RNA sequence: GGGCGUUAAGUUGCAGGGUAUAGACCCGAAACCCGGUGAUCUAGCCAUGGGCAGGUUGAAGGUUGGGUAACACUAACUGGAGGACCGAACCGACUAAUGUUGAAAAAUUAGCGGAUGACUUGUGGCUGGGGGUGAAAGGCCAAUCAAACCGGGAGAUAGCUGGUUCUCCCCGAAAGCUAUUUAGGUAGCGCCUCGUGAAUUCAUCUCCGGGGGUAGAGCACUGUUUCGGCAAGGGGGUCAACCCGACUUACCAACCCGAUGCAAACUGCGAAUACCGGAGAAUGUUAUCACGGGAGACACACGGCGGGUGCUAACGUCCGUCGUGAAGAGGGAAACAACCCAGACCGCCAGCUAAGGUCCCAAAGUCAUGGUUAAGUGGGAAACGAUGUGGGAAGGCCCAGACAGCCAGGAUGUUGGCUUAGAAGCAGCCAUCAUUUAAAGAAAGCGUAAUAGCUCACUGGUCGAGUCGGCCUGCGCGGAAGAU
RNA sequence: CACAGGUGGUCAGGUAGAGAAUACCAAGGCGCUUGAGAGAACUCGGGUGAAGGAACUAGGCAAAAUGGUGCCGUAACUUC
RNA sequence: GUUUAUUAAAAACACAGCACUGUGCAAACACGAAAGUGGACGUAUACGGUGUGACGCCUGCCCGGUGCCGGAAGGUUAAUUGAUGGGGUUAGCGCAAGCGAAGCUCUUGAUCGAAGCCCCGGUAAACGGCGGCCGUAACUAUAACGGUCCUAAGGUAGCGAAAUUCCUUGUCGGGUAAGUUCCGACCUGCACGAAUGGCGUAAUGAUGGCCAGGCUGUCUCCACCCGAGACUCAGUGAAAUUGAACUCGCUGUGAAGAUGCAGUGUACCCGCGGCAAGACGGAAAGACCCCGUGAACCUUUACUAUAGCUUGACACUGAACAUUGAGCCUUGAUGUGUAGGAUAGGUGGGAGGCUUUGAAGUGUGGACGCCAGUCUGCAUGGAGCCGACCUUGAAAUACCACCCUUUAAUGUUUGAUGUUCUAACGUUGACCCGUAAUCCGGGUUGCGGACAGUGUCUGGUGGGUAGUUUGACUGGGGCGGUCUCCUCCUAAAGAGUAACGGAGGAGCACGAAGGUUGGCUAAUCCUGGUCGGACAUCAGGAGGUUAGUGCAAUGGCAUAAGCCAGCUUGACUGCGAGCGUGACGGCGCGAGCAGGUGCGAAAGCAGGUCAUAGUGAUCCGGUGGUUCUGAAUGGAAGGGCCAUCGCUCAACGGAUAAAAGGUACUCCGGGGAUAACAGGCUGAUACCGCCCAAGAGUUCAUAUCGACGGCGGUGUUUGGCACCUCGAUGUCGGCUCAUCACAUCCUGGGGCUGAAGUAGGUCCCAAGGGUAUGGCUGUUCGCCAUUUAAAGUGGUACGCGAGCUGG
RNA sequence: AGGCGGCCCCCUGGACGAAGACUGACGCUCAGGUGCGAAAGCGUGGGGAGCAAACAGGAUUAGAUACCCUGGUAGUCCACGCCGUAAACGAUGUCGACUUGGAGGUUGUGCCCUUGAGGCGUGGCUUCCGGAGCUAACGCGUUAAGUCGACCGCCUGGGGAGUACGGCCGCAAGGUUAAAACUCAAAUGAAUUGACGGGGGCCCGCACAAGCGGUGGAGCAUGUGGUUUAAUUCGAUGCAAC
RNA sequence: GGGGCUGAUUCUGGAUUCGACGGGAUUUGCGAAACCCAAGGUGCAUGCCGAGGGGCGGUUGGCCUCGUAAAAAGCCGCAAAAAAUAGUCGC
C-alpha cells in the first residue's frame, strides 16, 4: 500500500542522455521500507567498481515490525545488477570525466522492486541558459502573440 | 407384520392427600396509575405600604476668573451623582470552640459581609405535580422532592427475608444427571416414603462363561534422547601463513549398527479389581422391578484411596469410588461436626469388652525377664558434621613387639636452568627417574630482600596389648530465632 | 414543653461621644421556679505569665496584636 | 450581587459588552386539544432562542462525518388509481369429460400522484475536526533544509511540567541553614488553544497557593488564678439497651481473635470517684461490592409508537378564457431482406366492385423528399389510367377491408400550472346598533379569496412526551474469552463421569467420490537410461504396510473398507419384528417380508459415501397432489393428510413479528452463597539464616564477599484461597501512651582478623536501661539540613476515633 | 501642503488686473506653542456593484508559501472620531534687492480704422531651451544651485541606528526626542574608458530555411579517452585535440 | 501487564524482476591432476648417500642444477605508496 516513489531533484540539474532500467538486490532485512513509503535516494550516485555495480550513501531506513534491532544498516555498499548487453559497454561511456551515474526512482513495475539509471554530466557548470531559455520562449511567444494578434 | 383395544364394573355421595382459578400460609417493599387537596414557610411574580441611626469620599453640570477669535482647556467656588467606602437596626451564614436521648429535629457565644439597592420587609392576590417556580444547586413547592402529600384498584407484587404454636408411633433421603435470560428457582429422572400386583427375582458368595488395554512393563512403530563403532565432508592446525592448503581436538555431521532412557494426546505386552450374563448352596421381614398416591432436594464439606488443575500450598478448587458429618448421641485423640472405636426402645446402686489406657490429677501393672536412650528427645522440621554411642559382617596391621607415646637419622647429584628482585622446595611450570638406599624430598608444610632456617615425609631405636579406618544398623547431639 | 428560638408598625430622657453603637443611670421594670455545702481529676467560659518567638501543625486555625480625630507624609502600577 | 433552608459561597451561577440565528406583526415562540391569553395595548435602534462574559491586543486552517440553508433534470415512493391479467360460481355445449356468455364476486397491481431521501452547491461566532516517519551543515549539537503516505486539512497569533504534564521531586536559578508547595525561565505539550474562547489586565474577593515584618501559651512545657458544671447533703427525677447469669488472667482448641470450653495461675463478698482497651459496646435489616430475567429517573444516529411539525388526496368549494388526455363523426393509412416500371396482396378466393355507387392531363400552392419516386390536390378539359411482371428466397396500392411497427379536421371530451371575478369562507380592517359595554352578535362597506384554516386518510419528520429489554458462565464483578456439534487424553482396563484443564476440527463435498462385476496393490531408497534436472516418464532390485482413504483426530482396512475399467441409477416405495441410546423431546442399528428395479450368468449385493461432525423443536404462511371435510343444499374462497419450501433464532431445546446505555442525585429486597481493610490457612515470591567450593583477596578457598546449585526457618512485604463478619468490626497519616519479642542502633562480655594504637571489619552472648530535632511533603517511606553515645527491625484491628483530629 | 476632474443650486476662502483715494512702517523671520496634513491602519455605526492582501484551487516550477489563471474576505464608499508617517520631491525652508535673451502656453489690461483672425506695449502665473557667472561635475541658470542681506532648522564618515533605555504622544499599530560599547577604512556623488544586457535600431558570413550529400545504423581503416599493463616512453586535453 | 489490529496487491496459494552474482545441469575441446598403456621418437639414464640457491629474507621440507663435494629458480615480507577519474566545489 505505498504508491511510486521519486528522487526528482536531479533531472533539471545534469545531463540526462540515455536510460536504462536496473533491477537490484536487497540483502536481508529491509524490504518492507519501500513497501511502507519510507525512503532515502539523496545523492545517490553509482560508482562503477569491479564491473560489479553499486549504490552507496542512500538511507534506506529500517522498518518496525522487523525490531530495528538485527536489522542490515541504512547505507549499505548495495550491489545492483543490469543485463550484460546493457552493462558491459557503458564504461566506455561514464569512464571519462566528472561523470557519474546516479539513481532516478525506486518505483516498482510487474510487481517488482527497482531503481533506474541514467548517464549525467557535470555540478562544476553555469547551469543557467537553458534556465533562460524557457524565459527566452514563453515572454518571446507571448510577444509574439501580442505582435501578431494585436 | 406392526401400532393402539377387546383379560376393566362404574357412577352419586361423605371424610380426606394434592393440583387448578380466585390474594390462596401469614406480615413486609421502592415504585407505576386514577381521582382529589395545598403557594399562611419557601421559589419567582403582582398591586399597595414601611424600613435604611452616624460619619466620610467629592462625579456631572453651573457660576467668579484666566484661555482662544470663538470653542477647546484650566484655576479656585458651588453643586453631592455612587450596584462607592467605614459602621447601627435589619438581613446574611464565612471561621472557630460549645451544643449534638442539646435549651433549639439547626441554635447560643465571639469574631465576620451586605447595609439608598439586582436591597430587605408588612399584609394581601396569582403559579399545580411529569406540573409549577428557579442568579439553574437537581435546590424548593408546609420539618418530607431525580416527580409533594390524601383516599383508591391494594390483599399491587416480591422466584428473595424472618417467624408457623399439642403429643405419641412408623420408615427415612439428596446436594447428582441432563435442560433452563438458568445458577438462590422449577420441571423430568436418579434418591425416601404409602398402596396394589408380579416371577428364585434382585442381594452376598465358590466354580464356570467372557470383552478389556489401567497399574506395572516395553521400546519395532507416532515421537523423544545420551554414548561408542560405522561415519560423507567440514568451519581449527602445530603449518602455506601467496599457494593446488603441512590438516584432526572439548567440534558437527544420513537413512545407519550395539547399549541405555523417558512418556496423559506411544503399545507388538499385561494383571489386580470393577461390571455385565449363565449354574448352584445357604440367608434376609421379597431386601426386586412394574403401576399408582404424596414428597423433599437440586448451596454439600471433610477423611482415606487412584487422579486433573495449584508451587504435589491451603479448612482450596473440580470429578471418580467408599465411609462417616449433615441426619448420629455414647467412649477415648486435653477441648476438637468429618478423625479412631461405636448405632442412644426404657429402667437397674447388674457382669463382659472394643478403641484408647493401667504413678497422680483420675478409673486400673509403681508386674515380669531381655534390651536402647542420658537428650527431659520421648515432648515441632532436615541437607550436613562428629573419637557420643549399642549391635553386627568383615577386611590389614597383631607376639619374628606393630598403635599413638619417648629418643635419633633425615640427603650428594641439584642455586636444575629459568625469571623473579636473589631462585635453594618455596613466587613460578617441567623432570621428580636416580649417586649413596639400613632409611633420607629437582621437596608435604610454612616464612620473608632469597634467605637463614624449621619440623615433617620415610625409616631405625626405646617400650609389652590392642588397634587403625571403611560399610551396615537401632537410639540420639547440633543446626532449632517471635511478638500478653 | 411556662424552650437561650422566631414577626411587622408606633414614642426615644440626662451625662462623654459623630450616633438609635457602646458605657453608667432615671421613669418604669424584672433579679431568670430547685436550692443550699465543700474548692478533686477533668470539661466549658475566662485573666495573666519567666525566656524563646510559628519552632505547633494540613495550613498562624485559634488566640493575641492594630484600632479614634487633626496635621505631616505616601510606591511600582492604571482603564488616570 | 446570588444560590444547595439543615455539611459545599467557590474557580460555581448571573451580569453589562459582543457574535449568530429566528421573527413583517393575526408576528416569531410558549401555556391551553380550542376560545383567547401573554409577547405587546410594543413593531427590527423591538422581541425571542442559543453561544461566550468589562475593556486592552486579538478571534488562524478544514464543509469529509454530522446537522441546518437554499436548488429541483433524473432515481426513489405512500393515500388515491382497478387497465391488464389470475382462480369458483351459471345460462349450455357437455351423450360421460371439458369449454363456460352478463352478473355479483376473491386476487394481482400497469397507469396519474407531493414532501423527504439519493443528488447539487453553500455554512464552523453551527455540532465538530487540526499528522506521521526519514535524511543531512564545520566530525559535537540538532535541523531552516529535501524526501513521500493518508486525510477535508495538519495547531499559526499568544502560551507551556500549568487549575491541566503520568514517567516526574523533569532541568536551572532566586527565595531557605534545608523547599514533593511557591516564584521565574527552559521544551521533550502522553493528553493547551482561539468564542463549549487564548494570552494579558487596574480595581475588588468571609477566595486558591506562598514569603516577610509586629505579635503572642499556637509550641518547646505548662503554671497558678477567675467563674459554671463535675462531688457530698436535701427535693423532683427521666432515656438508648437487655435470651439468661454465681460475668478473673494466660496458652491452646473451636463457623477459624472466648464473659462461659480443656489445662493451669490468681482472686475476702460488697460499694465510691476517675480512665476508656474488651464484651466483634449502643444506635442506622451496609449506602461501597454484587446475585434480582427487583425499581426509579436520565441520554442517543438502542425497538415500536406518539403530541407536535410538515407533504398530498377528497370534503368544506365556485363560474369564462390559455393549455389539455384518452376519447369523440368516415378511414385517409405508412410500407426498402445486397435482389428491385418500386410506396406490395396476415389466415384466406386467386384475378375488376369500377367503367354516368362520374379515372388521368399539365402547371405545380401542401407533402413521404438517399429524387427513385411520390399520399398529389385541383384553379379554365365533357374520359381509360391498370394484373401477369422487367431482377421474381417474398406479384402490385389491379380485385373484401374484422383497418395496422403507423396519422387529421370539425364540435363533444377534463388535471395542472395558468389568469380574472365574487357569491362560499377569513377579516385579532374601518363604521353603526343592542348600550352604560373596545368582548360577542347583527347590519353597512373595504380588503383578501377558492388559497388559507379546519376535518378524515397517508408519507417523510420527530428523546418534546411514555412503555421497557440491555443475556448468562465466572475461583468476587466489569474486561477479555467461552456457549452448538466431532475424535483423543484427562477418564481410575463395561458404560458414564469436571474445570475459563490439554492439542485439533465441522456449519460441507460427492450424479459419482454411490451401485454391483472383473481386476489391481503400497511410500521410501539404490542401480541403469534422452534434453533427467534434487526429487517427474522407464526397467530392475531392495523395501513388506512405515503409503492411501474428497477434510480434523481416533478406531479400522489387503477378501481391501484404497487404485482402475465395464454398466447405467437401490442417493428406491410401504413396512419392520428385536434391540443399544438418553429425563423426555429424541437421534442410532437393523435381520426378514410385499411391489417394481439395477449389477453380474449365477449363488449373491445395494434403503448411500470406511464409521464418527456437516445442523435447528414449535408455531406462522406460500406451492403441487389430495373424490378427507366443506356450518341449508350444490360448488368452493378457506381448513386436514401427503410431498415439500422461507432461519450465523451462533446466547444453537430457540422468553418478541423488532430492542443500547449512565447513576458518586440514587431507592428497595437480600448474602459473607461473593469482593475492599482486618482475622485464619498457607509460604512459591518477599525477608532472614544455614550448604556446597568458581574465584577474588600478593603466594594461600572461608580475614571478608562468594557467579553455578542446595536445604530450612520464623509468619513481617507483594501475592493465592474465599472459611468468620453485609440486622454493619471505621480503613491512610499524625497527635497520646505504655508493653512484649530479639534476627541488636549504642552502652556491656568475649572470640578471630589483611587487629601495631586511634579507630575499624564480622560473627558468639545479652533485651535491663536509652532510642532526636527541623524543611519539603497527607505521607509512614524518602530526600536533605543539622544533631547524636545511637537516631533499631518488626508484631500487637499495618497497637491506639465508646480519647482527639479529618490534611 | 497633501490634494483638487460629470452638472446644478446654497454658503464661502483666496489670487490677479483697472485707475484712483486712503492709515502711515502696522513689516520680515520664528525655538517652544496651535492648526491642517496622502494612502494605509484603528474605534463607532451604516451601505456594501466592481476591484482586491491574507486565503482556497489549477498550473508554470528542480523547488514557488510568488510572478499567470480561477474564485474570493479584511478594506476601497459614507458619517463621526483619533492616528500625524510617505520619494509629504522641484530631494531646491521663508521674504527681499539686483544681473544679458529667445521660443511658447495661460489670464488681465492701454491705444491705433481689430473693417477680420490684427499692431506694439506693461502687468500675473507657468513650461522649454540658453549666455554671462557658479558649482567636482551633472546641471541649475530673472522661478539660480549667481551676486548679497534678514532671521530659522539641520550635518560632522559608513555600519551600531534611526535601534536600545528613559520621558512625553495616542485605544492600538508604532509615531516622538535620541545614546553607547564595538567593528571594519571604506560607504559615498558625477564622469570616462572597456566588457556585458533575456535594452535598442542598423549591417555582415553557407551562420542561417531554401536544395544536394554523407556523418550518427552494422562491419571495417586511423587516432584518442579510459581498462588491462614489468612497461605498453611523452605531448596534443570543448570551443583552438582525437 | 493482559486483549485486538498491522508482518510483501492473493487476501486458502504456485513469481516471468528475459536482468549479468553465488551454486547446479546440457552442448565442447585438448593440456594429465578430468584419464591410461611402452610401442611410433630417444641416451650414457633413474633413485637412495651427501651438498647448494636472485643488493636481502620466505614456501611445497622442496621446483632448475651436482657424483666424492659447491655456483644458478615461479610466487610471498622490508619497498616504487604501483589512488588509474577524485566524487559533484571551489581557494
Ligand atoms: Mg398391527
Ligand atoms: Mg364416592
Ligand atoms: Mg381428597
Ligand atoms: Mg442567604
Ligand atoms: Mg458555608
Ligand atoms: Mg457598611
Ligand atoms: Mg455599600
Ligand atoms: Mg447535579
Ligand atoms: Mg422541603
Ligand atoms: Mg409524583
Ligand atoms: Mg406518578
Ligand atoms: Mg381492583
Ligand atoms: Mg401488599
Ligand atoms: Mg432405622
Ligand atoms: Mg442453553
Ligand atoms: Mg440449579
Ligand atoms: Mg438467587
Ligand atoms: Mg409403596
Ligand atoms: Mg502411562
Ligand atoms: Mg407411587
Ligand atoms: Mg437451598
Ligand atoms: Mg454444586
Ligand atoms: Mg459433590
Ligand atoms: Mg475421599
Ligand atoms: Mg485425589
Ligand atoms: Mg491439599
Ligand atoms: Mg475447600
Ligand atoms: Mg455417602
Ligand atoms: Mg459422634
Ligand atoms: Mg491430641
Ligand atoms: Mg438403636
Ligand atoms: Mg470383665
Ligand atoms: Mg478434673
Ligand atoms: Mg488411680
Ligand atoms: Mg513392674
Ligand atoms: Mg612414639
Ligand atoms: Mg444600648
Ligand atoms: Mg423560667
Ligand atoms: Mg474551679
Ligand atoms: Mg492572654
Ligand atoms: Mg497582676
Ligand atoms: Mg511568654
Ligand atoms: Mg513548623
Ligand atoms: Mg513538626
Ligand atoms: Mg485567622
Ligand atoms: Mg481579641
Ligand atoms: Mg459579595
Ligand atoms: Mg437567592
Ligand atoms: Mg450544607
Ligand atoms: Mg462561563
Ligand atoms: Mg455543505
Ligand atoms: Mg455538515
Ligand atoms: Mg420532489
Ligand atoms: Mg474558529
Ligand atoms: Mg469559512
Ligand atoms: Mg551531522
Ligand atoms: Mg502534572
Ligand atoms: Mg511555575
Ligand atoms: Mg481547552
Ligand atoms: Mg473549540
Ligand atoms: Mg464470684
Ligand atoms: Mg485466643
Ligand atoms: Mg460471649
Ligand atoms: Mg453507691
Ligand atoms: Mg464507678
Ligand atoms: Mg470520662
Ligand atoms: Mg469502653
Ligand atoms: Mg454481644
Ligand atoms: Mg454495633
Ligand atoms: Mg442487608
Ligand atoms: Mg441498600
Ligand atoms: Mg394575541
Ligand atoms: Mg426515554
Ligand atoms: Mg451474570
Ligand atoms: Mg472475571
Ligand atoms: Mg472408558
Ligand atoms: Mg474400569
Ligand atoms: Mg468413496
Ligand atoms: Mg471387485
Ligand atoms: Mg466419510
Ligand atoms: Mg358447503
Ligand atoms: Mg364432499
Ligand atoms: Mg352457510
Ligand atoms: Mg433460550
Ligand atoms: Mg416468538
Ligand atoms: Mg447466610
Ligand atoms: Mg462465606
Ligand atoms: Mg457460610
Ligand atoms: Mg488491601
Ligand atoms: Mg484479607
Ligand atoms: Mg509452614
Ligand atoms: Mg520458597
Ligand atoms: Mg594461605
Ligand atoms: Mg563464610
Ligand atoms: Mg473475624
Ligand atoms: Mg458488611
Ligand atoms: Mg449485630
Ligand atoms: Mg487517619
Ligand atoms: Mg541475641
Ligand atoms: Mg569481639
Ligand atoms: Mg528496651
Ligand atoms: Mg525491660
Ligand atoms: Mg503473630
Ligand atoms: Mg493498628
Ligand atoms: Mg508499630
Ligand atoms: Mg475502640
Ligand atoms: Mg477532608
Ligand atoms: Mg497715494
Ligand atoms: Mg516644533
Ligand atoms: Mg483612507
Ligand atoms: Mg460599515
Ligand atoms: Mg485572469
Ligand atoms: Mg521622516
Ligand atoms: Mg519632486
Ligand atoms: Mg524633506
Ligand atoms: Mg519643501
Ligand atoms: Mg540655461
Ligand atoms: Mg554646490
Ligand atoms: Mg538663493
Ligand atoms: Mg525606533
Ligand atoms: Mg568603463
Ligand atoms: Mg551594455
Ligand atoms: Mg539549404
Ligand atoms: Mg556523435
Ligand atoms: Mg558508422
Ligand atoms: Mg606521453
Ligand atoms: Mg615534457
Ligand atoms: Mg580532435
Same mark, same amino acid.
Given at each position: 500500500s505505498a504508491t511510486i516513489a521519486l528522487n526528482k531533484r536531479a533531472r533539471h540539474e545534469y545531463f540526462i542522455e540515455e536510460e536504462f532500467e536496473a533491477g537490484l538486490a536487497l540483502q536481508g532485512?529491509?524490504? !518492507?521500507s519501500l513497501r511502507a513509503g519510507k525512503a532515502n535516494i539523496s545523492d545517490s550516485y553509482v560508482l562503477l567498481r569491479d564491473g560489479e555495480a553499486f549504490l552507496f550513501g542512500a538511507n534506506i531506513t529500517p522498518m518496525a515490525v522487523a525490531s530495528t534491532h538485527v536489522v542490515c544498516d541504512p547505507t549499505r555498499t548495495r550491489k545492483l545488477l543490469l543485463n550484460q548487453r546493457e552493462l558491459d559497454s557503458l564504461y566506455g561511456r561514464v569512464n571519462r570525466e566528472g561523470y557519474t551515474v546516479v539513481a532516478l526512482s525506486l518505483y516498482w513495475k510487474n510487481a517488482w522492486c527497482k531503481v533506474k539509471i541514467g548517464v549525467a554530466k557535470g555540478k !562544476?557548470?553555469?547551469?543557467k541558459r537553458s534556465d533562460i531559455k524557457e524565459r527566452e520562449w514563453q515572454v518571446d511567444k507571448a510577444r509574439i502573440m501580442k505582435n501578431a494578434h494585436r
Open positions: 532485512w529491509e524490504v !518492507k !562544476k557548470q553555469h547551469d
